[PDB]
Design a protein around this ligand. Structure first.
Ligand SMILES: COc1cc(N2CCC(N3CCN(C)CC3)CC2)ccc1Nc1ncnc(Nc2ccccc2S(=O)(=O)C(C)C)n1
Ligand SMILES: COc1cc(N2CCC(N3CCN(C)CC3)CC2)ccc1Nc1ncnc(Nc2ccccc2S(=O)(=O)C(C)C)n1
Ligand SMILES: N[C@@H](CCCC[NH3+])C(=O)O
Ligand SMILES: N[C@@H](CCCC[NH3+])C(=O)O
Lengths: 485, 482
């Protein structure tokens, strides 16, 4: 029938069943066992064995109906499935009519079943109901997995995605397992989880336009946080020497497969740690995280989509370290001299952009030219293993401490997976007089009270989940991505 | 003694040490032990005993200075404290003169110390430096504990609060322990943690409004995680929860913050009675986990006053709101509470007792104000539930099985402040009057099983368990006007 017509039939059926005095949405059904526990407890029953002495109460959603006095159903719950075989021989006719009970049941209805466990004569693990009650009706027609495959409905109606395609549930189980592992990884090393405000009075910094909202009680316009960097460092001043936060941060810019205006970040700050501690932490976390999920350090990833051949990513540490300026000079055969914002070096960088591959010129400030020469010459050198780009010029990282030996550089590291930034870390500049941005006000004042030598690090949780669940879009690892209505 | 002069002097001191060649902000100091580990490793040695063979590298902040060849400092780290005993006998004169080294040290300075462990002649656990290096200077003068009492400096500069007041670091350690305990409590029962958007198109309270640039749309910060979590229940995640921040663009007060931390879980095939047993189990186990007892003390009327004891031993009393309101008021409030007859009787109670009349005086507002004056403070020596709220007060709560016009709702109160809100979820889409939010109503038509939902106020729970009277005292950085 037409999907519009099917909905009106079940709607009239609900009120038609309310007119007969029946409540089609009962309040409570006291379940005794779950479908996963039911599978594990009765997996090894005989072919055709019936345990008609053990009576159980089970719930689930009906996802299949089959055909007299014999009826068959598929009962799905917690991502697993069993069969329902309603036999007229085992039905309790004192509690109601067999036909009238099972005729009204359709696919998608949530039911509670009182019956016994057993396997079919063909060897299908089933529950044999003596009684079946409708707990919640399904008004619409549920589509087949073909019906959800290549459409945007997976994002607009995520609940049908989780019901119909088993791989979707696995993606988000993996996401939670990743975040659980990270939180436990930090707590095992003495890190302390905190909450910092999501709205502040200082707009975004140098990267993206902010989300602007009005605080009614203060009559002020505030800005959603672009990062947890500043308040976490103030806690380091406060004596919380190992601190971190896992939460949402916002950048009011354009959406694409690896950028979402609202995304999940983890930042930690580690007093008395330096650039080398942050490198070893990254190599330890990612290698142990991949082994925790897969039992191996090698994963497969369809970088260019499931249509195309996948690449193998090896997370066996150690990972290569590539110095940005020295490697750009190696691959471009040039030498870029003292301050990179010089008119001579900016001319040389722009003369590399257009002389070499015609790739896209930009608004030409020195940090942007360097950032795009790195994206064209470095960020795709290694696609079979993660690697760090290190020792970024201080003109690209104002809050990163100056390099100990190389002038004009910092002790910064950025880890890449398949050309995409996944981690950002550096030792934090703690000399208030060398922080030109103070010569944001609450943070500069806190620096004057003494920030110890500190190493900070930032993780992209959504992108990490993308690579570990073999996804090409960030929308595939977010439960409810914001979509155009 | 102007504070500006002190800052300019130490600023000049920093540049005076860079001109003499010394870097007062070194890059890395290789620590060998933390102050907590140092306390535990050497606490029970003899009075005056020195273990001069073990050389350690330790760091920390100097929090007190005292004074000719003997110098004393307090080194604090990770919320714990040791004494630093700088003796001229052990000083390494190759690295500099003893007098000038520790004379330049000021309260608040972060230093690295190379020395050996030992206890004072008085039996005070100390580090004995052979060398002391400045890691990061404190350019301002550290307030005193009095300086951070009546003033609101504790909120604008929380780092000074965490350094100066030992109880402040205890408050926020307890907060994280509460959230940690909650996450494990739910995960141990098979609950699944998820992340829901912070902005939605449909959004009890006025919303925070922000503009999405890429979509050219105005969106609203979530007032709650209720709707999308229930959609996940439809999706087959039968035990789901979220711990995060939610937003209500309303007035600030000691128990209401426009941005506050909430935990909501949804539990398929659970009902109102399961939610009560869950609440009694969680709060009793949480209080015992933090204190080793079910009884705590709380200064409801401030630390100025004597505290009251709150006993979290389950079970907790359950108070039906309508039947108990009529019991103490001697009234009988009839079938429809918004009837002109029942509204007349409630208003006749408000003015009888000289209570302020809520304006506009709607049935739900009158009921909520009789409960706040006659119920919500009846049992305050222990937590208790207010239950079975009229459905005119709970549009998303399922109707009561036997009592008409009521719901299967529960609200747990601690010291007159609501801390928990739970009910069996209305899952009949035709009985949801609000479906005349659009994505959620459509999902209800696909079948939401009988569900029990619950919401926790994490900030208020932390208030009572850390003996605080204001919500600003359990939030690290409360938002304030500059
Ligand atoms: C709208 O969304 C975003 C926009 C930007 N802007 C960066 C500059 C502009 N660019 C120019 C080039 N493009 C064509 C458009 C965007 C626009 C604003 C940045 C981030 C997001 N949001 C987002 N969402 C998911 N993951 C990441 N992670 C990520 C992105 C970039 C670097 C490092 C990490 S990270 O290492 O994972 C982690 C440590 C942060 N970020
Ligand atoms: C601006 O901030 C807020 C405003 C409201 N509005 C609803 C009440 C309205 N009133 C009118 C009269 N009032 C005197 C002033 C405000 C204003 C808008 C509600 C909540 C907050 N924010 C906040 N912050 C910390 N904790 C709580 N917890 C809380 C509050 C009320 C109920 C239950 C819980 S709860 O059970 O802990 C938890 C499960 C929810 N809520
Ligand atoms: N705040 C950074 C990541 C962590 C900062 C490093 N201290 C973004 O990008
Ligand atoms: N969103 C509610 C808490 C959960 C309601 C229970 N379904 C507030 O208060």
């Amino acid at each position: 029938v037409d999907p519009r017509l099917y909905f009106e039939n079940r709607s009239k059926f609900i009120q038609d069943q309310k007119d007969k005095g029946i409540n089609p949405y009962p309040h409570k059904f006291e379940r005794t066992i779950s479908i996963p526990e039911f599978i594990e407890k009765y997996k090894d029953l005989g072919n055709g064995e019936h345990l008609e002495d053990t009576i159980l109460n089970i719930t689930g959603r009906i996802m299949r109906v089959s055909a007299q006095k014999l009826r068959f159903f598929d009962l799905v719950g917690d991502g697993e499935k069993i069969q329902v075989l309603a036999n007229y021989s085992f039905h309790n006719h004192e509690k109601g009519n067999f036909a009238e009970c099972y005729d009204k049941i359709r696919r998608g209805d949530i039911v509670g079943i009182v019956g016994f466990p057993g396997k079919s004569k063909k060897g299908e693990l089933s529950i044999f109901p003596k009684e079946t009650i409708l707990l919640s009706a399904c008004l619409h027609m549920l589509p087949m997995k073909y019906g959800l495959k290549d459409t945007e409905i997976r994002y607009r109606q995520r609940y049908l995605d989780l019901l119909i395609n088993e791989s979707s549930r696995h993606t988000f189980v993996t996401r939670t397992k990743i975040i659980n592992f990270l939180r436990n990884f930090l707590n095992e090393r003495g890190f302390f989880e905190v909450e910092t405000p999501m709205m502040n009075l200082i707009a975004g910094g140098a990267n993206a336009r902010p989300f602007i909202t009005h605080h009614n009680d203060l009559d002020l316009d505030l800005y959603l946080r672009i990062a947890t960097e500043l308040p976490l460092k103030m806690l380091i001043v406060g004596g919380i020497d190992k601190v971190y936060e896992i939460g949402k941060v916002f950048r009011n810019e354009g959406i694409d497969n690896t950028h979402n205006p609202e995304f999940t970040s983890c930042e930690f700050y580690w007093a008395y740690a330096d650039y080398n501690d942050l490198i070893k932490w990254s190599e330890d976390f990612f290698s142990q995280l991949v082994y925790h999920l897969f039992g191996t350090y090698k994963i497969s990833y369809n970088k260019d989509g499931p249509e195309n051949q996948p690449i193998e990513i090896d997370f066996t540490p150690p990972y290569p370290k590539v110095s940005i300026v020295e490697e750009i000079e190696k691959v471009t055969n040039t030498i870029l001299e003292q301050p990179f914002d010089s008119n001579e070096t900016i001319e040389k960088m722009i003369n590399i952009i257009k002389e070499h591959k015609i790739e896209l010129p930009n608004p030409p400030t020195a940090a942007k030219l360097l950032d795009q020469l790195a994206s064209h010459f470095i960020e795709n050198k290694y696609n079979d293993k993660p690697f760090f780009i290190v020792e970024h010029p201080q003109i690209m990282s104002p809050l990163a401490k100056y390099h100990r030996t190389k002038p004009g550089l910092t002790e910064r590291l950025e880890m890449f997976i398949c050309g995409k930034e996944v981690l950002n870390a550096y030792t934090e500049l703690n000399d208030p007089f060398k922080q030109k941005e103070c010569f944001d006000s609450a943070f500069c004042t806190s620096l004057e009270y003494g920030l110890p030598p500190t190493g900070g690090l930032g993780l992209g949780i959504d992108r990490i989940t993308m690579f570990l669940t073999n996804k090409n879009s960030i929308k595939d690892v977010i439960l409810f991505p914001t979509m155009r209505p």
